[model samples]
Target chain A: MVFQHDIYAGQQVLVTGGSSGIGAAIAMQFAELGAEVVALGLDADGVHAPRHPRIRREELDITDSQRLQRLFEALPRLDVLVNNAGISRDREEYDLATFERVLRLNLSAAMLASQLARPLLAQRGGSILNIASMYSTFGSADRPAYSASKGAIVQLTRSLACEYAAERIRVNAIAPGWIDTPLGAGLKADVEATRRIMQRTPLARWGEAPEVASAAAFLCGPGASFVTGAVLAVDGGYLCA
Target chain B: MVFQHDIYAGQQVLVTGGSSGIGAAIAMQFAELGAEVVALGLDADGVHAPRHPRIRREELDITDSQRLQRLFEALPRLDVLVNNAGISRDREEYDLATFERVLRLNLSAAMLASQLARPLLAQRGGSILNIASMYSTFGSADRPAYSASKGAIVQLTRSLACEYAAERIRVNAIAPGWIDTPLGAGLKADVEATRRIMQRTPLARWGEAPEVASAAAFLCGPGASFVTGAVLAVDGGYLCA
Candidate 1:
């Protein structure tokens, strides 16, 4: 939906793993607000302009720190970095291979990218938004690694915020509950479980990916000039329940 | 904070504006979990024992309503009822008389007592925890009436997990983003500065209280068997920042 203004016009915002789901939504939203948006991920391979004139996509494996650093450095300037790339690895999170793989890309990759973007971010009072999960607070009995990684992301958000506040760089995280997206397809398939989730959520419904997008935009926009180190749960109050 | 066993060990529990702060710490933590606890206000005024016996006090001025319905009706079975009485007559709630009365107990008194000991709440239902604060989220600058009265409780734990849910009676409440609990003394001490400071931090740390006590307890109890309308800001995260 149109937001009624070019609030982010001329700004450069990069969304990691933005080819689909919540990340794509965040990237598109920035473009809609007149920002130069770049989406990078395996899903974005060989892609150019798709969402809008200001939004572009590129293929890259963020886990490859060398390539990740190269991309961030290649950018002329950066105003916002949306660390949204991640993998569930489901119950496989138990196996050492899966655990290391998921954490490497989901948690560690974000840190690497952020470190690379630090100088650019400090250059112009920028913001960094990490996409955590409701699982961050409580572990999923099945997906142990995903749970642990997201938990660390929460603390990481805090540390960066405290460290960067002095440079006018704000860091924050968004813990999205079961959003109605392709990623949540499995949950939607579980009729009984989905029903229970909706009932417990204070708002009594699943949140939309765009809902998280708006939250991210708000943090990145001037409106949240003083916001930092906070984890906003766009979970329909699910966490509170 | 160690207690013998079950604490409430099969006795009734009731807490009025039990003495000080958060109904005097939920009436000494339900009489150290050994139940048989009762706490009334100055309305139950009487020159009697100081604090225990699991009893010994009077002053039930919960306005008009028969508190004669007092203390569990001698029922051999009573779980817990924490109707922590409270009021805030700050900054001229309205008029001098309006300041002296109605709003003083705007939406409380018998309402609390009844709701607390309601038939459902008494029937193995989990909990009926209420203590709405600062408009249930924000605050009213110079309006005591607005502050206390507007802070309406969230009627039902929203839709509380549907049928198959695993627990029994459990009702939770959210006390806004910045609560004025005695524990939050330091934050309020600075007033505007603190409010702004609290608002600036995402978790809104100081916006917690004895209400949080039940949050943690029920969290592990059958009551929270399902995280309905959540309301357990226990993670200490806050919005508006």
Candidate 2:
């Protein structure tokens, strides 16, 4: 139970935007490890959804309040809520449209989904793992909306956790910096970006997707029973000064 | 002007909840240094409304969003905003009302105030020194509301700073543990409390108010211009673990 392919065997877990990126990685990890895992997506073509029996797919635009309400009604009782479906459109000062959209998808939608999912989680005494960024703790240029919304998400995670603590629901956040998945491909090719990253990141390279996946898994697992409202940095010591 | 009269002068500052406790001490330190200071409160009491020329009293409760809005609009400009006003309601896990009230006042109110202050801070940036507590970084019994709210406030400080990086507004938070002050006086005198405090507090005794005040002064002034989005601990290394 500490860690294995069967890490989450009997648990019911949910990861937003699970078709790809960190969400996809986490969902797959949970499924391979034997959990009853469901990955939610706003897109119809969730072709990447795990074909494995333990992993199911739900096309859920988590930002739609009513859609979330309906989804939860039909959705199996979930033990985990990973608020990771976030979008970022970066420019020098950030695009205003992108900024607003990020807020909508990140803070408001995440909170509503958590609210809807709360009753189920509280009943079962489960976990709420929020997906934040190293940017949520510090920052980089051209990432205002992404940073701000994610930042609020961490706070929301704590607030909601305390609101529902009596029921034993553990709410925590994971902050990952310079993740080396396809998500960070843009920064990979740019030497300037790489150099800047090397200078700022103590580990001196981007972290693997599993590094983040493993942390999410750990928080949702029993080892963190006493933990709640914690924003644990999954970054490779980037937050250490 | 850095440390004249044992205060930070030539600075324009605002201390929320400066009416009493930690806020008053911090304000006095800055004022002693020659800073043009304003202490926002809901009363004219402990803040000593008429004691110092450098200190001006404005009865603005940060918990009142509209009142805060009006006050910030008329204040011309400021160099710092110390979101220090907070209240604690001790109740057991089953009490929902106490939880909501405590979080609203201690965490949400500060977040809302910071949100409203961002516009005035836009472009012409400043510093936001939020007063946090060790409870924000650690969990405790019966103080769930305080722990949750304070913890949320710590992260909110970081996120706000990250989003405002381009604007050059430096946002930071300080977490103090078992400091000796008017309100904290009882904790030091309680034998049982002191015994428990000594176990984890390497300093072995409660910290003086001025010690925390000095740290606030450091983060608020140009001394910390390069630092932002940081939640520092003045907790006698209780967080060393």
Candidate 3:
């Protein structure tokens, strides 16, 4: 079925870490397309509040596996799972514990959530999208764990695609290059680094949150029925050149 | 430091169908990475033969300008060129005029052979690779033309990787999915249509013939040394499902 623009209307989608940044953009777009969007975020200190009718905001620490399991089980029916919640802690770079935490949240959490959401996904022949990074292909000396975790997600995506395809459950990922989000503030602030990135990128600029969201929506919609286990890069062709 | 794979030890590489499937496994992994390797095929009549000592074998057809130029030039340096000669009929309910031979090679040949193999690529730092396929992203209903000439080699490999990346010279392409080699023939003959490929490929299954040759020896050495205009797809997790 061709999923023109409003194909997602009335569909149910879950976007983790949706309170802000890229996650929020993804959640909002799905809602704009009329999907009942469940945006999950820790909302530490209640900083995030929902501003749209279709979007339902929830504060939950996904790191708490037990609670996440319950949340998945309680949802009426999940047609798409956007495992977008992710974090980076470069400060504690030297600490193994911090590395573990980064991996736990960025990689393991996505895996666990996918596992929990399998039944719901299987029911609707839905999709699971793991959010990877440019780091998934290249490594950064400063971000050892983050790089490794993102790399693992690439393999994990391929693995789950094979395991789940039989049930019509598709798994894929999006490797966003540098986007103009809070997460990108660090790169944007570093003038030289920023210059180098833009110059290297064929599109020659930072991507907007909405651009990545559009890619997410495409993957979630029927337009991508034949796509799975593929990690589409929404990075203005940064990786190619 | 250049890669010293025993297979491609010699610099020059030429892989045109090369008789066997997957161009004789990339001309015996580039003559076991030892010497210049040349492979050829019409295999159309299936009459074939060859071995190694920097492997050599042949019989062919290519654009007039390129063949004449290379022969007239004797080109002191021909480092690498892997234009996997491909042909597709697509047996759809179409007439000869529509087939019109499609003109789309696995990759744009005459253009790439002329562009990348310009005298500049013969310099110390030259490399050219063009064998992209997975139908070059998207599909074709009528003519095959190497799956739509790999969607026009996506900007002809970034416009010759930006007019030869200031002269270090490197260009790449890879879209190894359901190859047209011997393996493809087997799968083609099988009526079950091989559930393995369908379920496993994110595009599901059938990504042999160098499941990547480590992505053609990583764009053929020095880890591509900041490659130019690359197009890579090592199949299996076909698209982002």
C-alpha local distance difference test of each model: 0.65, 0.71, 0.68
Q: After superposition, how far is residue A109 of candidate 3 from its true place, in Å?
A: 0.8
Runs of candidate 2 with Cα error greater than 4 angstroms are: A1-7, A42-49, A92-95, B1-241
* DockQ agreement of candidate 2 with the native complex: 0.02
Q: For model 2 chain A, give the 10-residue run with minimal summed lDDT.
A: A232-241
Model 1 regions lying over 4 Å from their true place: A45-50, B1-241
Task: Give the 10-residue window scoring lowest on summed lDDT in candidate 3 chain B.
Answer: B1-10
Q: Can you rank all candidates by TM-score, best first? A: 3, 1, 2
Model number with the top TM-score: 3
Q: Please state every model's RMSD to the true fold in angstroms.
A: 15.8, 18.0, 15.0
Evaluated on the second chain alone, the candidates' TM-scores are 0.30, 0.89, 0.32
Model 3 DockQ class: incorrect
Indicate the worst ten consecutive residues by lDDT in candidate 1 chain A.
A43-52
TM-score of each: 0.56, 0.52, 0.61
> Model 3: DockQ against the native?
0.07
Better of 1 and 2 by lDDT: 2
lDDT of candidate 3 over B39-151, digit per residue (tens): 75654335333366677675555434466346426645566766666666665415554344445344445364546466746476666666767667857575455455667
